Amino acid sequence: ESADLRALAKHLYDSYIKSFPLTKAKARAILTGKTTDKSPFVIYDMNSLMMGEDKIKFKHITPLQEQSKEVAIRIFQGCQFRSVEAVQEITEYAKSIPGFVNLDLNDQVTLLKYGVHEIIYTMLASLMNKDGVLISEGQGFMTREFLKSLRKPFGDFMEPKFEFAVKFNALELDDSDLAIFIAVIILSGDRPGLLNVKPIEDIQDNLLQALELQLKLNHPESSQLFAKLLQKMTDLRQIVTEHVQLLQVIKKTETHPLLQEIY
Amino acid sequence: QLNPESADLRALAKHLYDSYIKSFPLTKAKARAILTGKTTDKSPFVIYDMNSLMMGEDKIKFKHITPLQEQSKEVAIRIFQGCQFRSVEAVQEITEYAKSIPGFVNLDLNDQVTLLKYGVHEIIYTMLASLMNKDGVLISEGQGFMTREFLKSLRKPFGDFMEPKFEFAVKFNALELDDSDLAIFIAVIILSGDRPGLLNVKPIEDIQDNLLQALELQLKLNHPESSQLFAKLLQKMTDLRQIVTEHVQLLQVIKKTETDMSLHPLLQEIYKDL
Numbered sequence: 255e256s257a258d259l260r261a262l263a264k265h266l267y268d269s270y271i272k273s274f275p276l277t278k279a280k281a282r283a284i285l286t287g288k289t290t291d292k293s294p295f296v297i298y299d300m301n302s303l304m305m306g307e308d309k310i311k312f313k314h315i316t317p318l319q320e321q322s323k324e325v326a327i328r329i330f331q332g333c334q335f336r337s338v339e340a341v342q343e344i345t346e347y348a349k350s351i352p353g354f355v356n357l358d359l360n361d362q363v364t365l366l367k368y369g370v371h372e373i374i375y376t377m378l379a380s381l382m383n384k385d386g387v388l389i390s391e392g393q394g395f396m397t398r399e400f401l402k403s404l405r406k407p408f409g410d411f412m413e414p415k416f417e418f419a420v421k422f423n424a425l426e427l428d429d430s431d432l433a434i435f436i437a438v439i440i441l442s443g444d445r446p447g448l449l450n451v452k453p454i455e456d457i458q459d460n461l462l463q464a465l466e467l468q469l470k471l472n473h474p475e476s477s478q479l480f481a482k483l484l485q486k487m488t489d490l491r492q493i494v495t496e497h498v499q500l501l502q503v504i505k506k507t508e509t510h511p512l513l514q515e516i517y
Numbered sequence: 518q519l520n521p522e523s524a525d526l527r528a529l530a531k532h533l534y535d536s537y538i539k540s541f542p543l544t545k546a547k548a549r550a551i552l553t554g555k556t557t558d559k560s561p562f563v564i565y566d567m568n569s570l571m572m573g574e575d576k577i578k579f580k581h582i583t584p585l586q587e588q589s590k591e592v593a594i595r596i597f598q599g600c601q602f603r604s605v606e607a608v609q610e611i612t613e614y615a616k617s618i619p620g621f622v623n624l625d626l627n628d629q630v631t632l633l634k635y636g637v638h639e640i641i642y643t644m645l646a647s648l649m650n651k652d653g654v655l656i657s658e659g660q661g662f663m664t665r666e667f668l669k670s671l672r673k674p675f676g677d678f679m680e681p682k683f684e685f686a687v688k689f690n691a692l693e694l695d696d697s698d699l700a701i702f703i704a705v706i707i708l709s710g711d712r713p714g715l716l717n718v719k720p721i722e723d724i725q726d727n728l729l730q731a732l733e734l735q736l737k738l739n740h741p742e743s744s745q746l747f748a749k750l751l752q753k754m755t756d757l758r759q760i761v762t763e764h765v766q767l768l769q770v771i772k773k774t775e776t777d778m779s780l781h782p783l784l785q786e787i788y789k790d791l
């Protein structure tokens with residue numbers, strides 16, 4: 255019992271570290287100033303973004319020459335590109351969750367299709383503070399006020415998440431906590447169209463225990479942390495559906511053929 | 518065993534289960550008996566169509582009272598005004614319930630109201646779970662029963678108000694919770710702290726902190742074979758939000774299709790910029 259819980263806890267942690275480049279500990283260190291010795295390039299306005307490209311050579315999303323002429327759009331484009339990377343990082347992590355690869359292939363896909371956003375938002379918080387967000391592997395920091403400062407719906411998107419990031423991080427969880435947490439979200443037995451809910455649930459349950467214990471040791475001081483963390487899941491749901499809203503709101507823009515398919 | 522510290526938590530539990538019973542006429546226990554047939558005095562008149570809908574008023578005093586001129590021309594509407602007045606009495610009860618929550622009235626008055634503001638529908642739909650089974654829901658304080666099918670037809674929008682409700686009720690009722698559990702859970706929902714505009718959020722959380730602690734011991738004690746019932750119930754809080762919103766969405770649509778339908782004042786300040 256209290257044996258396995260601490261075993262599965264370390265595994266997930268050890269795995270999460272081996273799947274996510276920029277950890278919560280890292281990103282945290284940076285933002286503050288603490289030992290890393292190489293401050294980030296601050297995108298605070300236009301000339302900053304402009305200079306940013308050729309410095310943080312995040313010239314990944316930036317390239318696709320001829321669709322590189324309108325900040326707000328070239329940014330959101332980039333957000334998506336890195337979002338696709340995350341998904342691969344997540345899917346990989348998923349498969350280290352004890353039992354996950356043993357499920358019906360169909361349900362794995364399903365659990366993943368419905369869990370990446372909630373997971374993306376959760377981790378994103380790790381890289382943002384009340385003032386801004388860490389971009390490009392930690393190299394940059396795009397101020398928060400610059401984001402609200404975007405043309406159309408292009409300036410609403412990031413405002414919510416900031417609002418959500420502030421509360422979430424107010425719980426002061428670290429990578430060892432988040433690792434378990436994230437697996438719980440993945441093993442969500444309510445994802446639409448599943449086929450065999452029992453296994454999933456039997457797994458999430460084992461996960462929920464591991465997490466509850468993880469919280470009591472790593473946080474003796476904080477009462478009912480486990481409960482507060484679970485409630486946050488509601489914030490993710492709302493947040494995610496909402497995001498999926500403007501995604502359709504934005505479908506009145508950008509007005510390559512292969513570019514689209516990749517997304 | 519349960520020593521010193523835990524002892525205080527059982528009290529809070531009993532204190533609330535007690536206000537709950539005193540605040541709600543139709544507990545879940547009574548609702549179950551009525552629905553499961555362990556009765557020859559508690560059997561409800563079933564409504565699955567106009568036939569019985571007609572004999573509805575001519576068979577059961579309607580605690581589903583549709584007031585605006587006793588009747589109209591639109592049944593679905595007729596139904597809806599009922600579901601409307603009823604909802605109001607619940608907000609009324611729930612409010613009398615909240616007051617009993619240790620500390621709730623010792624908070625700033627503005628905050629008290631915003632807690633109720635957002636907490637009311639979330640609580641209304643939890644309670645509503647108690648009155649439902651896959652085939653329908655009780656009405657007129659148990660005296661009646663409306664089948665899921667009749668509701669699902671009604672009309673254009675109106676045939677879509679209750680489905681999300683039945684959908685969650687089935688999943689929710691599955692936790693097999695009883696009034697004593699619900700009473701603590703209901704208190705947690707009110708004392709959130711993530712409610713829009715709470716002036717002083719902190720004291721609100723010390724309250725929920727204790728309620729959550731109560732709910733955790735209660736569930737432990739009342740369901741020794743329920744692995745992680747605590748967490749599973751907390752997760753159910755999202756389904757609640759979706760229900761609420763998805764409903765408000767629905768409401769606004771009705772606010773145009775039906776230029777003549779009256780919405781209860783109170784019911785309106787709940788949604789006001791909700």
Ligand SMILES: *C(/C=C\C/C=C\CCCCC)=C\C(=O)C/C=C\CCCC(=O)O
Binds near residue numbers: 517
């Ligand atoms: C913003 C950019 C990056 C977020 C991705 C990962 C952060 C975690 C890093 C930890 C090391 C993107 C979003 O906020 C929204 C994401 C997806 C929605 C778009 C869906 C699509 O493009 O198909």
Ligand SMILES: *C(/C=C\C/C=C\CCCCC)=C\C(=O)C/C=C\CCCC(=O)O
Binds near residue numbers: 603604784
């Ligand atoms: C209620 C639909 C039917 C009522 C069911 C049972 C009545 C018997 C109770 C015995 C104690 C649907 C809702 O309650 C609607 C919720 C809130 C109304 C506010 C305005 C709105 O959102 O429509």
